[PDB]
Structures are given as structure tokens and as C-alpha cells.
Amino acid sequence: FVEMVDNLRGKSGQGYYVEMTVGSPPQTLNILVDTGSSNFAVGAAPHPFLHRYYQRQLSSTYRDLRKGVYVPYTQGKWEGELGTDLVSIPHGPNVTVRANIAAITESDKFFINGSNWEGILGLAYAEIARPDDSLEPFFDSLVKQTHVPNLFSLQLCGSEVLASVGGSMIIGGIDHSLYTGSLWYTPIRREWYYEVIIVRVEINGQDLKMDCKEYNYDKSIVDSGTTNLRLPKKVFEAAVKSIKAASSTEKFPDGFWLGEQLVCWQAGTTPWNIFPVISLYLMGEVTNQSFRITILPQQYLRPVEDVATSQDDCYKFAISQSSTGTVMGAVIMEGFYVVFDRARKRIGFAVSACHVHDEFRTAAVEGPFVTLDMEDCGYNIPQTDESRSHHHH
């Protein structure tokens, strides 16, 4: 899969993108790789933050579906017109597919100034697609129309501009050069988000000792479209307390722990060893088994080069509170080669050949851990009448 290695780019904190082509003849666009959503949607009209956009009129193969799509979310919205066209990934499999494409005609707080992407590739399942689950997601179309195996894998690798990031999206396979050691699999609990189950959390080898359902309240997901590790409020508070205690030789402002302020040390003097490792134990394929993924402060403290003090190494705390469950975002994923094995309803983790570490500690994937009488750590989201009324033909 050499042709697919190093096919991802981006700016730190602004998401990883892949080059794609849309239409005939092919129009090149940079597309955000998002395992936390399920639409393929591209800028299709001028916008202050877009150097270019999908020109439907320039494509001989474009078909209008005569249907709009409106997608509000917490931080903003995008909307536009549904259609189909021919799509390929130049540094991906040598295939071309007819996929659904949402042509984004209006948006608010969606595009990011300087991120260098013009669209989004939702890699999650039909259940969370807009306007509804009848709009086939891109990967579903790719698998159905071609011989591409139903699996993809992601290796995300962590003064005037933001730091450039790189990585690999391997479509249809696993590239053994992208990881070392064992590849461990956790079940996909349900196919909507890439939902998983966390059974235990440790901070510097110390158990947080919470009811494990708290770790998955109201879900836990693997999301390339979230920068941070995000934790449910109660879990976040417990984690911050534990990380504070370990790093107590340093008194940081409240702003730091809120992710609203950088902390700095003189170049190359960052005291990494005062910050603890964080271990998330994930449910194994076997009953009563788990494995752990362990990340370093090199993952949860994001480097940000300050113009005023380029003399110093400065960092943002990249663990944050959630009210919508655990989000294993780029913070987690940058430690690991992550296999989205849709065919076998499981997600694989192995130590990434590109993860940032020091000579003392490393990001790790370790198991098995067995528990005599393992509890169900899954949370069951209260069923609304809205949701219950939906017919699923």
C-alpha cells in the first residue's frame, strides 16, 4: 500500500485531510478525514476561507438529486444540495466510484481559515448520515461498487504558521510498516459512530475506580474529526485531579487545565516525566478480556509555537470535558495505528511507527487483561419518542 502511505496532511489542531477528485474531468479538493460523521460534503460556492470549490457545472458526470440537506451541530452548520458524481482518491485505490455528494452552498463556523481543506469525508455509518440513513455514505458506495475490502486504517502522526501534520489513510488494508508489536481489537458496539467500550481508566498506573459505565456515558467513540481526548464531566474532573497531583511541582493557571492558555518552558527543557501516562482499557474480542492503550504527555500536551516567545516550547492541554460521552480524538489516535475493520465489526490498535515519545516512555498497546466477573460497561441512551417513532424499512 506504498501509494497510500503519507497521503494525509493538515495543520495542528485543524484536522487531517486527504486529496480527492470529484467530477469529470477530475476536480482536485482537499477533504477532511472524519470518522465522527457520515456525509461526503464539499464547498461548492465561494467562501472567504476557500481558495477553490466544487464546480458542479464543470462536471459532465454530475447528477442533481433535487434534494437539499441541512446539517446543524453544536459549533455551527453547513447546508446545500444533494447530488451524485464520480469520485476518486489519487493517493488511494486505483478506482473511481459514483458517490453521493452534498454541495455546500451555505455554512457557518464550518470551514477553518488556513486549514487547507474544502470538504469533509464522513467515514462513519449510514445511521448518522443527513438528511437520513437512506443517503449512502462514501465508503459504503466504494465497497459496493468495487472490490475494495470493507476496512480502512489511519496512522495520524502528530513561528508564523501552525505546525504541519502528516499521516496515512490506507483504504482496503493494513500496512505492516505503519506499526510495531501486536494489533489488538475492540468490538464496534454499534454501527453508527465507531462506538467502543472502555472498561477501566488509569492515570500513572492508578485506577480511577469509577463505575465503568461512567467511562461510556453516554457513549465512547473513535473520532479523527475531534482534536482532543474528550471525557465525560465526572471522568474529566477525576483525570484532571490525578494529572494535577502528579505534576504538582508546577503550578499552572486554571486557564491551562481548561485548554484556554499555553504553558511554556525554555526550549528542550520540558519536564515530561512530571506528567503521568494515561491508560484506557478497551473491551476485548473475548468475554472477560481487555487490552490497554497508553498515551504519553507528548500526546495530550499539544505543541503551539508562540510568536512572542519562540525562545520557548509552549503547550496546550488537549484533554477536555464532554457532555456527549468519551471522544478518542487525534490526541489518542496519534499514539497508534488504528484499524477500522468494518467487515469484522471491530477496531484495531497497535503502537504507531510514527508516534512522538522520549527515551524513557513510549505509547503502548498491551494485553490481555482478564477480569473474573466483568460488568457491562455500556450505557443505554434513553429512547426518545422521536427516535422510537422512526420506521426502518
Residues known to be catalytic = 34, 223
Residue 167 binding partner per list ligand 2EX, Ni ion, none, with a CB distance cut-off of 5 to 8 Å that depends on partner kind = none
110 binds ligand 2EX (CB under 6 A): yes
Cα separation, 49 vs 55, whole angstroms: 16
Residue 140 binding partner per list ligand 2EX, Ni ion, none, with a CB distance cut-off of 5 to 8 Å that depends on partner kind = none
Name where the chain breaks: residue before each gap, C-N > 2.5 Å: 158
Q: Where are the beta strands (DSSP E) in 275-360?
A: 278-283, 289-295, 301-303, 312-317, 319-322, 326-328, 336-341, 346-352
Kindly identify the residues of this chain, within the stretch 300-359, that bind Ni ion according to CB under 5 A: none
43 binds ligand 2EX (CB under 6 A): no
Residue 391 binding partner per list ligand 2EX, Ni ion, none, with a CB distance cut-off of 5 to 8 Å that depends on partner kind = Ni ion
Among 345, 347, 340, 342, which Cα is nearest to 280's? Answer: 347
Least Å from the CB of residue 389 to Ni ion: 10
36 binds ligand 2EX (CB under 6 A): yes
Whether 59 contacts 27, CB under 8 Å = yes
Whether 107 contacts 44, CB under 8 Å = no
Nearer to Ni ion, 359 or 385 (CB): 385
391 binds Ni ion (CB under 5 A): yes
223 binds ligand 2EX (CB under 6 A): yes
Size of the site for ligand 2EX (CB under 6 A): 14
Q: Which stretch binds ligand 2EX (CB under 6 A): 31-39, 51-59, 61-69, 372-380?
A: 31-39
Surface-to-core class of residue 72, CB atoms within 10 Å of its CB (0-12 exposed, 13-18 middle, 19+ buried):
exposed
Least Å from the CB of residue 92 to ligand 2EX: 19
Q: Which of 27, 37, 216, 326 binds ligand 2EX (CB under 6 A)?
A: 37
Nearer to ligand 2EX, 36 or 83 (CB): 36
Least Å from the CB of residue 392 to Ni ion: 8
- 274: three-class secondary structure by DSSP: helix
Among 324, 66, 372, which Cα is nearest to 218's? Answer: 324
Cα pseudo-dihedral 132, 232, 218, 124, rounded to 10: 40
Whether 167 contacts 244, CB under 8 Å = no
227 binds ligand 2EX (CB under 6 A): yes
325 binds ligand 2EX (CB under 6 A): no
Kindly identify the residues of this chain, within the stretch 72-101, that bind ligand 2EX according to CB under 6 A: 73, 75
71 binds ligand 2EX (CB under 6 A): yes
320 binds ligand 2EX (CB under 6 A): no
Residue 226 binding partner per list Ni ion, ligand 2EX, none, with a CB distance cut-off of 5 to 8 Å that depends on partner kind = ligand 2EX
Kindly identify the residues of this chain, within the stretch 124-163, that bind ligand 2EX according to CB under 6 A: none
Least Å from the CB of residue 134 to ligand 2EX: 18
* β partners of residue 365: 293
List, as own/partner pairs, every contact residues 146-151 make where C-beta atoms lie below 8 angstroms and the sequence separation is at least 24, other chains included: 146/93, 146/95, 146/97, 148/93, 148/95, 148/172, 149/173, 149/343, 150/342, 150/343, 151/339, 151/340, 151/341, 151/342, 151/343
Cα pseudo-dihedral 108, 112, 118, 121, rounded to 10: -80
Least Å from the CB of residue 35 to Ni ion: 31
Cell, residue 225: 474529526
Least Å from the CB of residue 362 to ligand 2EX: 25
Q: Which stretch binds ligand 2EX (CB under 6 A): 68-76, 92-100, 332-340, 367-375?
A: 68-76
HEC profile of 198-245: EEEEEECCEECCCCHHHHHCCCEEECCCCCCEEEEHHHHHHHHHHHHH
Residue 287 binding partner per list ligand 2EX, Ni ion, none, with a CB distance cut-off of 5 to 8 Å that depends on partner kind = none
Interface residue list for ligand 2EX (CB under 6 A)? 14-15, 32, 34, 36-37, 71, 73, 75, 110, 223, 225-227
